Write a protein that binds this ligand. Structure first.
Ligand SMILES: O=c1c2c3c(sc2ncn1Cc1nnn[nH]1)CCCC3
Ligand SMILES: O=c1c2c3c(sc2ncn1Cc1nnn[nH]1)CCCC3
Ligand SMILES: O=c1c2c3c(sc2ncn1Cc1nnn[nH]1)CCCC3
Length: 266
């Protein structure tokens, strides 16, 4: 069971004007903090984190898969491709595509990687193989960002995101090099300095993956944090709003992350 501080969480989303989903877990004591942990939230760009873990799982079936060169034209350059478009005239390897997708939310690199895993159904198939029965990816990049209310497409729950991130970063779902390569990619993410990272002390190691749909006030972040002298903490913070024109807030994601750490005891 949970040691929940629901009163500050409820007032936080009251000022935000939408819904906030949080699920945190102390991997040493099993204590959990859950607020709307079973509601569905649009994944947005946060699926790229599990997309890279899927490619890392296939690298165990295909040795040296991450060093495979992949060429592409402008037609594949989806808006916001700040890494893949610089290598348009030469291409990138699969490992570089995965690093760009996780660390820079590279949309072109994500579509190119999804085309190699069997599409959104292929990535969803990998999540079922690790035990995730809530995750579902339906559309390709930028289309998956519609975040329509009541739409189960391209959604998951903060609890299922947290439990899946735990099994991929600290569990047996990946081999030791594949697991360490996943943690390294999340640690080097550059998009989450104003979210979960803003609520974590600087002397703590953290690896995160963000996601911003833009519309319906839908932004999110999940991370596994490494406090000093304690067992690691895995958490997910997901937000959405009832109106299309509603804006998201990175400070609300940081504040919810701060409340989850306090509710746990760090
Ligand atoms: O090029 C960058 C970069 C780069 C970064 S961050 C960034 N942000 C925007 N942009 C511009 C952009 N292009 N397409 N969407 N945004 C680091 C490596 C060098 C290129
Ligand atoms: O934003 C940029 C950019 C941009 C460039 S280059 C560059 N380099 C780093 N960065 C920031 C950075 N990302 N990772 N390390 N540093 C051209 C278009 C505008 C944005
Ligand atoms: O994805 C974008 C985008 C996009 C833009 S701007 C932008 N800036 C940062 N990022 C990086 C990011 N956002 N949330 N997590 N990481 C327009 C088309 C859709 C994608």
């Amino acid at each position: 069971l949970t040691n929940l501080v629901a009163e500050p969480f409820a007032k936080l989303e009251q000022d935000f004007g939408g819904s906030i989903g949080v699920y945190a877990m102390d991997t040493g004591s099993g204590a959990t903090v859950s607020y709307r942990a079973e509601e569905r939230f649009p994944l947005c760009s946060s699926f790229k984190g599990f997309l890279a873990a899927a490619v890392l799982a296939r690298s165990q079936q295909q040795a040296g898969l991450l060093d495979t060169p992949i060429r592409y034209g402008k037609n594949a350059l989806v808006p916001w491709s700040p890494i893949s478009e610089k290598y348009l005239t030469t291409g990138m390897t699969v490992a570089e595509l995965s690093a760009a997708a996780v660390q820079y939310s590279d949309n072109a690199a994500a579509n190119l990687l999804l085309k190699e895993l069997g599409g959104p159904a292929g990535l969803t198939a990998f999540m079922r193989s690790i035990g995730d029965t809530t995750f579902r990816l339906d559309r390709w990049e930028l289309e998956l960002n519609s975040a329509i209310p009541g739409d189960a497409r391209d959604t998951s729950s903060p609890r299922a995101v947290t439990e899946s991130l735990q099994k991929l970063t600290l569990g047996s779902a990946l081999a030791a090099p594949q697991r360490q390569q996943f943690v390294d990619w999340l640690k080097g993410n550059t998009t989450g300095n104003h979210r979960i990272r803003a609520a974590v002390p600087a002397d703590w190691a953290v690896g995160d993956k963000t996601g911003t749909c833009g519309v319906y006030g839908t932004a999110n972040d999940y991370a596994v944090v490494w406090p000093t002298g304690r067992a690691p903490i895995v958490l997910a913070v997901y937000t959405r709003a009832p109106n299309k024109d509603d804006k998201h807030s990175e400070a609300v994601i940081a504040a919810a992350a701060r409340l989850a750490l306090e509710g746990l005891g760090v």
